Design an enzyme around this catalytic site. Structure first.
Site, mmCIF file in Angstrom:
data_model
loop_
_atom_site.group_PDB
_atom_site.id
_atom_site.type_symbol
_atom_site.label_atom_id
_atom_site.label_comp_id
_atom_site.label_asym_id
_atom_site.label_seq_id
_atom_site.Cartn_x
_atom_site.Cartn_y
_atom_site.Cartn_z
ATOM 1 N N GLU A 152 54.894 61.610 27.737
ATOM 2 C CA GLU A 152 53.936 62.382 28.518
ATOM 3 C C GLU A 152 52.515 61.975 28.125
ATOM 4 O O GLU A 152 52.222 61.786 26.932
ATOM 5 C CB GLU A 152 54.129 63.893 28.342
ATOM 6 C CG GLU A 152 53.531 64.793 29.472
ATOM 7 C CD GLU A 152 53.912 66.270 29.326
ATOM 8 O OE1 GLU A 152 53.920 67.017 30.331
ATOM 9 O OE2 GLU A 152 54.223 66.702 28.194
ATOM 10 N N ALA A 287 54.837 68.446 19.425
ATOM 11 C CA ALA A 287 56.212 68.499 19.878
ATOM 12 C C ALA A 287 56.301 68.168 21.361
ATOM 13 O O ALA A 287 55.475 68.637 22.151
ATOM 14 C CB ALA A 287 56.810 69.871 19.649
ATOM 15 N N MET A 288 57.330 67.385 21.727
ATOM 16 C CA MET A 288 57.532 66.844 23.064
ATOM 17 C C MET A 288 58.835 67.383 23.617
ATOM 18 O O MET A 288 59.896 67.187 23.013
ATOM 19 C CB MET A 288 57.562 65.306 23.064
ATOM 20 C CG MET A 288 57.670 64.703 24.458
ATOM 21 S SD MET A 288 56.645 65.599 25.656
ATOM 22 C CE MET A 288 57.301 65.009 27.202
ATOM 23 N N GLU A 289 58.741 68.028 24.779
ATOM 24 C CA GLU A 289 59.800 68.826 25.381
ATOM 25 C C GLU A 289 60.794 67.985 26.173
ATOM 26 O O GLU A 289 61.339 68.463 27.175
ATOM 27 C CB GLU A 289 59.177 69.923 26.262
ATOM 28 C CG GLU A 289 58.668 69.493 27.656
ATOM 29 C CD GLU A 289 57.161 69.233 27.771
ATOM 30 O OE1 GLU A 289 56.548 68.742 26.792
ATOM 31 O OE2 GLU A 289 56.591 69.480 28.877
ATOM 32 N N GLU A 323 58.759 74.881 23.232
ATOM 33 C CA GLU A 323 59.540 73.750 23.716
ATOM 34 C C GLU A 323 60.727 74.220 24.541
ATOM 35 O O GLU A 323 60.942 73.740 25.659
ATOM 36 C CB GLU A 323 60.000 72.894 22.541
ATOM 37 C CG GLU A 323 58.864 72.253 21.760
ATOM 38 C CD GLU A 323 57.720 71.751 22.636
ATOM 39 O OE1 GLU A 323 56.536 72.071 22.369
ATOM 40 O OE2 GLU A 323 58.001 71.027 23.604
HETATM 41 O O1 USK Z 1 52.534 71.753 24.326
HETATM 42 C C1 USK Z 1 52.783 70.589 23.979
HETATM 43 C C2 USK Z 1 51.739 69.759 23.204
HETATM 44 C C3 USK Z 1 50.840 70.516 22.333
HETATM 45 C C4 USK Z 1 50.001 69.435 21.654
HETATM 46 C C5 USK Z 1 48.824 68.828 22.409
HETATM 47 C C6 USK Z 1 48.685 67.423 22.347
HETATM 48 C C7 USK Z 1 47.610 66.826 23.004
HETATM 49 C C8 USK Z 1 46.686 67.591 23.710
HETATM 50 O O2 USK Z 1 45.604 66.925 24.370
HETATM 51 C C9 USK Z 1 46.828 69.008 23.775
HETATM 52 C C10 USK Z 1 47.907 69.616 23.112
HETATM 53 N N1 USK Z 1 51.557 71.362 21.340
HETATM 54 N N2 USK Z 1 52.231 70.850 20.264
HETATM 55 N N3 USK Z 1 52.802 71.910 19.510
HETATM 56 C C11 USK Z 1 52.464 73.064 20.140
HETATM 57 C C12 USK Z 1 51.689 72.739 21.282
HETATM 58 C C13 USK Z 1 51.141 73.820 22.196
HETATM 59 N N4 USK Z 1 50.457 74.920 21.532
HETATM 60 S S1 USK Z 1 48.805 74.659 21.406
HETATM 61 O O3 USK Z 1 48.133 75.874 20.905
HETATM 62 O O4 USK Z 1 48.148 74.464 22.677
HETATM 63 C C14 USK Z 1 48.589 73.253 20.290
HETATM 64 C C15 USK Z 1 47.926 71.956 20.523
HETATM 65 C C16 USK Z 1 48.017 71.091 19.270
HETATM 66 C C17 USK Z 1 48.746 71.802 18.208
HETATM 67 C C18 USK Z 1 49.097 71.373 16.781
HETATM 68 C C19 USK Z 1 50.400 71.046 16.455
HETATM 69 C C20 USK Z 1 50.758 70.672 15.148
HETATM 70 C C21 USK Z 1 49.751 70.638 14.125
HETATM 71 C C22 USK Z 1 48.436 70.979 14.449
HETATM 72 C C23 USK Z 1 48.083 71.352 15.737
HETATM 73 S S2 USK Z 1 49.177 73.247 18.787
HETATM 74 N N5 USK Z 1 54.060 69.981 24.265
HETATM 75 O O5 USK Z 1 54.946 70.686 24.902
HETATM 76 BR BR BR Z 2 51.285 65.602 24.651
#
Ligand code: USK
Ligand code: BR
Ligand SMILES: *[C@@H]1O[C@H](CO)[C@@H](O[C@@H]2O[C@H](CO)[C@@H](O[C@@H]3O[C@H](CO)[C@@H](O)[C@H](O[C@H]4O[C@H](CO)[C@@H](O)[C@H](O)[C@@H]4O)[C@@H]3O)[C@H](O)[C@H]2NC(C)=O)[C@H](O)[C@H]1NC(C)=O
Ligand SMILES: *[C@@H]1O[C@H](CO)[C@@H](O[C@@H]2O[C@H](CO)[C@@H](O)[C@H](O)[C@H]2NC(C)=O)[C@H](O)[C@H]1NC(C)=O
Ligand SMILES: *[C@@H]1O[C@H](CO)[C@@H](O[C@@H]2O[C@H](CO)[C@@H](O)[C@H](O)[C@H]2NC(C)=O)[C@H](O)[C@H]1NC(C)=O
Ligand code: NAG
Ligand code: NAG
Ligand code: NAG
Ligand code: NAG
Ligand code: NAG
Ligand code: NAG
Ligand code: BR
Ligand code: BR
Ligand code: BR
Ligand code: BR
Ligand code: BR
Ligand code: BR
Ligand code: BR
EC number: 3.4.11.-
Length: 915
Positions: A152, A287-289, A323
């Site tokens: 993604e 994390a990637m869904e 996820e």
């Molecule tokens: O949702 C997703 C992808 C996003 C990640 C993403 C990547 C690129 C981007 O430009 C915007 C967001 N994510 N990853 N884990 C939870 C979430 C969503 N909860 S979050 O509060 O928005 C959030 C954003 C980044 C987080 C993080 C995770 C681990 C360590 C420190 C910080 S945590 N995939 O399904």
């Molecule tokens: Br992403």
């Protein structure tokens, strides 16, 4: 054509010049075969795409980036000019659009399926995109390589040529080839594995359901799993580096519980037979869904109870629900285009509330969900904000669309909507939408229609309002006109950038209401404010209780000014009960005084999510130029009796944020005074906190927060416990168990001496919990010596000792702290060429690096340097929407300092003077 444009690698013209793929050729079934080595660090591969042609053409356009295409034949079953063996296609690469063109020898006949087939090869990528290489350290010190795919949003094209736009959904059949020492995972389970001539194995995965490209996964590694089955019969497996298998138990437990809850709550069995969650170490996204193969970074999935915080657990629980949720919201139903990405993530983020609150009520996560909105509001309160769905076309503009507006504001308006409709009507609307768009795509409109047109129990009675042959009644006309009201309502919340401010004057029994775009950095009487309120107008579902009753009056406001009558003239009125509504209330007249009255007296007459909202609103109005700071500061006096860890922890944040703010400039006079107010007014709660792991989740959080506060203001008794726990820890060679909720405090006290700092850096490399590693890195950034902090970011650029995925996180820590604030900002400037080689300009890493080192600046001088830096960036290829948001943030900090600093100095000196 005119031969006009554009020139392909090899020098012939490309028959296409759109960034979006043409839609005349539609893919049905990808037949993919991937054979990576992992000692070559490369792969060879083949694909057969079964495609339906509808408008006749003489060329096919599809995406392929950084892939050596070397065969390309075309066979057909129905157009017998291309009967097997088929004909060859001339191939053209237009890299500038990441596109390729396959050149047919004869125009394709409409309404006939063809089979497009290319062979291709590439080195394994080494940068957290496409099919890439990634490593992990064993307990023995062995480094092992795994090869994993993150696609993604537009990176599938990096690993196999394909129609890489999310509307082109298809079935995939994935075949992998592997040494006997590795396992192979992909989206579906594994039908057969055939042993081959040279002892190599070939794994044959079940054929995927109709799915979008960016969700395809395949991993080649040697992890070990832990398995269980859901009520529904899904084989959930938590996959992990084999020495960390015993850190996967929670994950399994929770995902079993969660995957169950979702199934029942959506009324849609999770379709696939298995589901795998794998913890990868070199994972730039959180994390990637990927359907059946959700990849998490270890810190987002694993859990060591010796070293993982309580909040660490809640984080893992949240991410696992987030996820899981995507399996439906995102994968069953997918956005038409990235412009409507929040239909994917903004639902997943709302659901983790619902889901966690349903499965781990123990985790008290409903009391924490308001932060998700308060966070975004600070950014929706700037002209720099975007609407929930905004057009996006470049890869970068897409990436850009995953900011907090899509995740958070999307989440909050849903919770707002849901509280408008009540959860049983709101769940029935969510089902009627996941069912209606199963295996298809939806756009923004599609959703609002399907939620608007809810059904309480599809009563299907003698004349159910929904289904069969209904009865034509007074209610039915209310139903259909009340439904169009809520679609016509949420359409403004997704098309208008920003967030409304409701003004409330109390005129005896008559209450007058005004609506306007809430904004910061800019007052009402500013010459730039009349020009930003112009056409903004929401349909704001108001609510309110009063001093004389707890009944929840509900009224929709569809105009710029409105007035409501009221009975039993009350002492005060509270608008936006529980702060469920995505908007701020400002009580004009004696309104702000009268509420502070209640909080300073009995205070329970306002229900805790009111206090949290009131605490929040009061301060932002101070940053809106509407309230003199001394009003918001006077609310915090009540915190002394605040029994509710949430509202206490919030009011506390502002009072602490000022301290860090003052400390970043040598404003020691207010700096010391703020310390002295914090440690003396909150001394009774600080002192009763235990240095242990005991208590409820909110109890634990309030321990760590306060113990950190105390050691960040250098409270000798609290620094002394951490010094001593640290020394005991270091003299046991790491064997003594510090309580988790104290684990970060003790390390960053220990980091304060270079003996401690050194032991922590040595201990970082030897730790078997990412959770611990992370706390140690915060400890290391706590250092006051610049040469140490500079080593940290030096180690981050090498990617060996400290992996680069935490380098953005690392920089941000360092820059938060005053000693390292310039060091960060200076570093980013001196090596901006090198950061661009490591990270994509649209990455979350780069956006965080930018705002991580600049958005806390609060001086006109640093604003100039920032404007100057961003200018240089715009002059080169780089352009990000964040540049403006940073500058509007710095500007808001300069203006808030100018209007309010002397009020903060007199307020605090006044407090000293009273006691
Ligand atoms: O949702 C997703 C992808 C996003 C990640 C993403 C990547 C690129 C981007 O430009 C915007 C967001 N994510 N990853 N884990 C939870 C979430 C969503 N909860 S979050 O509060 O928005 C959030 C954003 C980044 C987080 C993080 C995770 C681990 C360590 C420190 C910080 S945590 N995939 O399904
Ligand atoms: Br992403
Ligand atoms: C990834 O690449 C690695 C190496 O880059 C590769 O491992 C190599 O595999 C070859 C066979 O494919 C191995 O060579 C064979 O070793 C066996 C030992 O039992 C011998 O019986 C073989 O002798 C016959 O085969 C030769 C050619 O294969 C003939 O020249 C010979 O006359 C015999 O007919 C042969 O020596 C080699 O040892 C490994 N090397 C390593 C380092 O493992 C691996 O297969 C690739 N993996 C994937 C998944 O692609
Ligand atoms: C592609 O995936 C779709 C699912 O979207 C498969 O469709 C199912 O096929 C079975 C077997 O024929 C039917 O009984 C189901 O009712 C179908 N479900 C839906 C939602 O359409 C399809 O079989 C797959 N195609 C290939 C070629 O494997
Ligand atoms: C979180 O879960 C709780 C239950 O654990 C939900 O509270 C219930 O809400 C329904 C409808 O409002 C009431 O009829 C029940 O009596 C409540 N149970 C209680 C209070 O124990 C709550 O709605 C959930 N929160 C969210 C945001 O979904
Ligand atoms: C082909 O493209 C044209 C573009 O105007 C469209 O109107 C038509 O419906 C398409 N499909 C056909 C002709 O089958
Ligand atoms: C394409 O692949 C086949 C085997 O898959 C091979 O025989 C052929 O030489 C390849 N390339 C060309 C240019 O024919
Ligand atoms: C399993 O986890 C426990 C507690 O987190 C840890 O102490 C132990 O060392 C792990 N098992 C092994 C065999 O190391
Ligand atoms: C706010 O953003 C809009 C976007 O078009 C722009 O036209 C306007 O000039 C901006 N106002 C300020 C004060 O930056
Ligand atoms: C607040 O009012 C309630 C309701 O009568 C009462 O039970 C409680 O003791 C009061 N608290 C204070 C501090 O007056
Ligand atoms: C604040 O004053 C101290 C005095 O010891 C000085 O060393 C330090 O550099 C000053 N910090 C800033 C940011 O001016
Ligand atoms: Br079910
Ligand atoms: Br991240
Ligand atoms: Br991780
Ligand atoms: Br959390
Ligand atoms: Br203490
Ligand atoms: Br500054
Ligand atoms: Br200045």
């Amino acid at each position: 054509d005119p031969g006009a444009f554009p020139v392909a690698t090899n020098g012939e013209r490309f028959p296409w010049q759109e960034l979006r793929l043409p839609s005349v050729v539609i893919p049905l079934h990808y037949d993919l075969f991937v054979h990576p080595n992992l000692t070559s660090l490369d792969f060879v591969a083949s694909e057969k795409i079964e495609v339906l042609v509808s408008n006749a053409t003489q060329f096919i356009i599809l995406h392929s980036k950084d892939l050596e295409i070397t065969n390309a034949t075309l066979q057909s079953e129905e157009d017998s000019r291309y009967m097997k063996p088929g004909k060859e296609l001339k191939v053209l690469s237009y890299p500038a659009h990441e596109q390729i063109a396959l050149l047919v020898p004869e125009k394709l006949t409409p309404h006939l399926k063809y089979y497009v087939a290319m062979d291709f090869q590439a080195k394994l990528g080494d940068g957290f995109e496409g099919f890439y290489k990634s490593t992990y350290r064993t307990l023995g010190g062995e480094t092992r390589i795994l090869a994993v795919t993150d696609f993604e949003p537009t990176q599938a094209r990096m690993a196999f040529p394909c129609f890489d736009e999310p509307l082109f959904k298809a079935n995939f059949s994935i075949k992998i080839r592997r040494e006997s020492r590795h396992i192979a995972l992909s989206n579906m389970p594994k039908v057969k594995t055939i042993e081959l001539e040279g002892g190599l194995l070939e794994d044959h995965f079940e054929t995927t359901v109709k799915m979008s490209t960016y969700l395809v996964a395949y991993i080649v590694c040697d992890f070990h799993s832990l398995s269980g089955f859901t009520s529904s019969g899904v084989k959930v497996s938590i996959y992990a580096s084999p020495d960390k298998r015993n850190q996967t138990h929670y994950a399994l437990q929770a995902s079993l519980k969660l995957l169950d809850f979702y199934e029942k709550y959506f009324d849609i069995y999770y379709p696939l037979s298995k589901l795998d969650l794998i913890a990868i170490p070199d994972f730039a996204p959180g994390a990637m869904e990927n359907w059946g193969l959700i990849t998490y970074r270890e810190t987002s999935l694993l859990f060591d109870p010796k070293t993982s915080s309580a909040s660490d657990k809640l984080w893992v629980t949240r991410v696992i629900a987030h996820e899981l949720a995507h399996q439906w919201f995102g994968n069953l139903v997918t956005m038409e285009w990235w412009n409507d990405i929040w239909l994917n993530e903004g639902f997943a983020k709302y659901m983790e509330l619902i889901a966690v609150n349903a499965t781990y009520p123990e985790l008290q996560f409903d009391d924490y969900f308001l932060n998700v909105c308060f966070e975004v509001i600070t950014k929706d309160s700037l002209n720099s904000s975007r609407p929930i769905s905004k057009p996006a076309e470049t890869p970068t503009q897409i990436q850009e669309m995953f900011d907090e507006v899509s995740y958070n504001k999307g989440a909050c308006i849903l919770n707002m909507l849901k509280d408008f409709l009540g959860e049983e009507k709101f769940q029935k609307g969510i089902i009627q939408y996941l069912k209606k768009f199963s295996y298809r795509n939806a756009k923004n409109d599609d959703l609002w229609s399907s939620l608007s047109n809810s059904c309480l129990e599809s009563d299907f009675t003698s004349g159910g309002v929904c289904h069969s042959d209904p009865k034509m009644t007074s209610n039915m006309l209310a139903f259909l006109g009340e439904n169009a009201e809520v679609k016509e309502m949420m359409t403004t919340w997704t098309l208008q950038k920003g967030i409304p401010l409701l003004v409330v004057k109390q005129d005896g029994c008559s209450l007058r209401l005004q609506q306007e775009r809430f904004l910061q950095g800019v007052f009402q009487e500013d010459p730039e404010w009349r020009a930003l309120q112009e056409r903004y107008l929401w349909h704001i579902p108001l609510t309110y209780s009063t001093s004389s009753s707890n009944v929840i009056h509900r009224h929709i406001l569809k105009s710029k000014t409105d007035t409501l009558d009221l009975p039993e003239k009350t002492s005060w009125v509270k608008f936006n009960v529980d702060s469920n509504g995505y908007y701020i209330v400002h009580y004009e007249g004696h309104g702000w005084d009268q509420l502070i009255t209640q909080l300073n007296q009995n205070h329970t007459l306002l229900r805790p999510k009111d206090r949290v909202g009131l605490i929040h609103d009061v301060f932002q109005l101070v940053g809106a130029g509407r309230l003199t700071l001394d009003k918001a500061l006077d609310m915090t006096y009540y915190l002394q009796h605040e029994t509710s860890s949430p509202a206490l922890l919030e009011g506390l944040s502002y009072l602490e944020s000022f301290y860090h703010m003052m400390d970043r400039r040598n404003i020691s006079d207010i700096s010391e005074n703020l310390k002295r107010y914090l440690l003396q007014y909150f001394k009774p709660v600080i002192d009763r906190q235990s240095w242990s792991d005991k208590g409820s989740v909110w109890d634990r959080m309030l321990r760590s927060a306060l113990l950190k506060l105390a050691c960040d203001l250098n409270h000798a008794p609290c620094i002394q416990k951490a010094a001593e726990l640290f020394s005991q820890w270091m003299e046991s060679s790491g064997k003594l168990n510090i309580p988790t909720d104290v684990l970060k405090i003790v390390y960053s006290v220990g980091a304060q001496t270079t003996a401690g700092w050194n032991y922590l850096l040595e201990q970082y490399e030897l730790s078997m919990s990412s959770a611990e590693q992370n706390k140690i890195l915060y400890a290391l950034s706590t250092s006051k010596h610049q040469e140490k902090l500079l080593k940290l970011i030096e180690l981050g650029m090498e990617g060996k000792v400290i992996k680069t995925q935490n380098l953005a996180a690392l920089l941000h820590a360092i820059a938060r702290r005053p000693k390292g604030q310039q060091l960060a900002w200076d570093f980013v400037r001196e090596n901006w060429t090198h950061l661009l080689k490591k990270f994509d300009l649209g990455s979350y890493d780069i956006r965080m690096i930018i705002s991580g080192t600049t958005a806390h600046f609060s001086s006109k001088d640093k604003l100039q340097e920032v404007k100057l830096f961003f200018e240089s960036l715009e002059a080169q290829g780089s352009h990000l929407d964040i540049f403006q948001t940073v500058l509007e943030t710095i500007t808001k900090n300069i203006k808030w300092l100018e209007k309010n600093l002397p009020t903060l100095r007199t307020w605090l000196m006044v407090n000293t003077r009273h006691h």
